[PDB]
Symmetry: C2
Subunit: 351 residues, 2 copies
Amino acid sequence: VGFDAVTGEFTGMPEQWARLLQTSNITKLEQKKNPQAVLDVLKFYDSNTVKQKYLSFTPPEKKMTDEEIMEKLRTIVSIGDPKKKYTRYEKIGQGASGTVFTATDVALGQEVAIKQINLQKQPKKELIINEILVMKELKNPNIVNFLDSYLVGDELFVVMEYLAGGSLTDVVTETCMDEAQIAAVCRECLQALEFLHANQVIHRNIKSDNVLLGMEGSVKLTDFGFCAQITPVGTPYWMAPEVVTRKAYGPKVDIWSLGIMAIEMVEGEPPYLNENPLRALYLIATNGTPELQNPEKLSPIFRDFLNRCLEMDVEKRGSAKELLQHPFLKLAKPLSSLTPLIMAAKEAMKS
Amino acid sequence: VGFDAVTGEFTGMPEQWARLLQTSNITKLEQKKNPQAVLDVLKFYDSNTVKQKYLSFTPPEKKMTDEEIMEKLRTIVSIGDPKKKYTRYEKIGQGASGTVFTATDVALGQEVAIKQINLQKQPKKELIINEILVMKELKNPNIVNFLDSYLVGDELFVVMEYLAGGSLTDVVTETCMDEAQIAAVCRECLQALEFLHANQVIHRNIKSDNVLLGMEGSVKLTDFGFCAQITPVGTPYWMAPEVVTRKAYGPKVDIWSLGIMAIEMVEGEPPYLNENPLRALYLIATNGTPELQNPEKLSPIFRDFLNRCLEMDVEKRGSAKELLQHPFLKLAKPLSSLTPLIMAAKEAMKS
């Protein structure tokens, strides 16, 4: 509850938070200069709910029987064998979100992601089916869209779009993107965010891992809902200061995350790489922006874009509609300019 | 068209029927004494359509989209894995009626038959689904009833009741049924036929192969519709003279077939066993009843029942409601009396 400034002791802290603080590698001086922030990040880290989101309501606003399931599945389920329509199956994930596969549609030659939900075992069947119903009308080229679904016993196969160019992470870790490429990627991600925000969705997880690239440079976001959670513990480097403050927050957390990602595209790794997670949260809460590797190397107009994304004041932080008009995006190359970086990244994996 | 009595030549016969008649092993004298019958059986044998029946209209009277299929399947499909709910799968048939399996329900311990229909490849999807919808309300203990269905991709699994005692054929070929056992089986088959007839269904295939026995002597018919076609070319020994005449026919063909089956239960084999099929049809058309092995061995009251089933006049042939009241059925033993015959038959198969 309270803090004594000269001793440096918090008064009346819960069992867990006293325990966490000792492991935090936050200094007594740091506790002194920002006592409120420390309590905020201790509370945040203690919460640690997986906090799964589901899109709801197909129209503009956005204990179950076999017959009610078959009612809901009327407009989503195709009569087809997913073992004949798709090949090159590879398992890429398993957990509470279903098992997940990549595969290739035999007829079109296009890669897809297939999520497999056990309707009998899975809790909140109604939410998942409701999300698919949303996803059928919630269509945009910069997201992974719902393609198809199949009922295989008690197992619902949800097929989403996918791309064969890898993640943006692979490109930034293995190559050096110039600013005109970074502008191109930022523009595509802002187009996606503008669409998501227009439809009352906050993504919440904008990071290069959730940015999927096609071979000709097409860009799509993933991990915004349940169904699009098709990519597979540590520091949440991408989170805005309001979130880790445990304040109420809005769509401009995605803008913060986009700024963090633009820094990742320059430095070739995420920030806070070797930090204690609690210290990292503390640093996000007090400092916001992690200090740059070598900031003279960037152009002023990119530094401007980075500032407008990484403003700590939510009112001063830019909207997606606003940043779409920012001069940095005018430096943007054709998306095909990414093709050599993607191929280089693919042949550099060597694993 | 015509016949010249002294030469013994039919005039103006089609290509096929002149061809068939030479292979028929019907005599010139036999052609003479019954010229009309010969033409009737030649026409009948030339027709040879598989002539699949489907029950239609669930209420008292009795180019398709994925969404229309999922509409129709609303009340029939369970959300479950048929590979986990049933074990001891054995494939017992394949063809135009789907692939067919026996299996055992894990939870209940009861044997079932599972028919597997490819919805994408199968013609007349609507008829099959309509039949299942009938089968859900068309319930009787002396038929195999619809239990459950599952959608597995484009494959619809239809689960029907089954029994582990084998067919009536196995019991008659390997054991000697006394008349009180035969009365018991006839009563059960007439109870089934009375129900089928009451619901405007003619079975059309009453033979011991389609009579399924349980271990404690329970009796059920199969092969009346599409779904109940769960048992797997030669002589149609069981057919009434009206059918092979190619006249119009009614439900009392099932009564003829029941009489033929009661003879099979005595002689231990079907009639016409080594005949030419065309001669067999000729003999059914002219003589009706095949001549008995040793008729003094049967009781007069059984011979009476056999006469009322195997009357060639449809008006004199008995109805199922009528034969249920016939004195022969009063000789009927408890169905458990079949249990030793079934076990004997099962251990006699040795294959």
